[PDB]
């Protein structure tokens, strides 16, 4: 997260870190045994880390649970990042309380202008590299389809939306991928891509979760 703020320990209780010896992506807990992330985060050998604030220090609310299966969306195209979404099942159920909690799926697609909370452990610099160790947060509005397509001609599908600031300075970034965009208490986006970070007229691009609620529910119901 570039230009954000320190969330505070366990204030984003659905935020997970995907660990394969190191944090490599975020995700969102959507029930006690399922996490949703970005398909471009896929790898074997994932351990899901819940209850994290400082990902380099054991602070006392962590749950470390290995993945039993990962399901990349059947239509994921890694070249275009269309359908950049995947589901990760936990080997055992997470224990849920105030510091570890699932985030509700949307009942509808949120509108341009809605303010959302974007969070992750990714790079905090647009020129250079500094990773924060504790969870960072950003409040940002969903942008119109027309501003999104004008920023990224030929690249925005119906499964994507932009959020952030056309002036730059505030954005998600490398290492935030797979993590949440939450608006009015519902998971509306997954951190997916962007040209650099916090650049002018290059806002963040996010997987549009509302398109995938039926796939997520039916996948969970049969796996
Ligand atoms: Ca920790």
UniProtKB/Swiss-Prot annotation:
GO terms for biological process: digestion; proteolysis. Subsequent cleavage after Lys-125 leads to alpha-trypsin. Further cleavage after Lys-170 yields pseudotrypsin. A cleavage may also occur after Arg-99. Synthesized in the acinar cells of the pancreas. PROSITE patterns: TRYPSIN_DOM (PS50240), TRYPSIN_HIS (PS00134), TRYPSIN_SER (PS00135). Disulfide bonds join 7-137, 25-41, 109-210, 116-183, 148-162, 173-197. Its cofactor is Ca(2+). SUPFAM superfamilies: Trypsin-like serine proteases. Its main location: secreted. This is Serine protease 1. It comes from Bos taurus (Bovine). The gene is PRSS1.
């Amino acid at each position: 997260i570039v230009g954000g703020y320190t969330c505070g320990a366990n204030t984003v209780p659905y935020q997970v870190s995907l660990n394969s010896g190191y944090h490599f992506c975020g995700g969102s807990l959507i029930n006690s045994q399922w996490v949703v992330s970005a398909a471009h985060c896929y790898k074997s050998g994932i351990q899901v880390r819940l209850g994290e604030d400082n990902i380099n220090v054991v602070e006392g609310n962590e749950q470390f649970i290995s993945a039993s299966k990962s399901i990349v969306h059947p239509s994921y195209n890694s070249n275009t990042l269309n359908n950049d979404i995947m589901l990760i099942k936990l080997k055992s159920a997470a224990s849920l309380n105030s510091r570890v909690a699932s985030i509700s799926l949307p009942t509808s697609c949120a509108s341009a202008g809605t303010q959302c909370l974007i969070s992750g452990w990714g790079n905090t610099k647009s020129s250079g590299t500094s990773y924060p160790d504790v969870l960072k947060c950003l409040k940002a509005p969903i942008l119109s389809d027309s501003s999104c397509k004008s920023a990224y001609p030929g690249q925005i599908t119906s499964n994507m939306f932009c959020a952030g600031y056309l002036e730059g300075g505030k954005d998600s970034c490398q290492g935030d991928s797979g993590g949440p965009v939450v608006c009015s208490g519902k998971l509306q986006g997954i951190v997916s891509w962007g040209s650099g970070c916090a650049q002018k007229n290059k806002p963040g691009v996010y997987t549009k979760v509302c398109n995938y609620v039926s796939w997520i529910k039916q996948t969970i119901a049969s796996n």
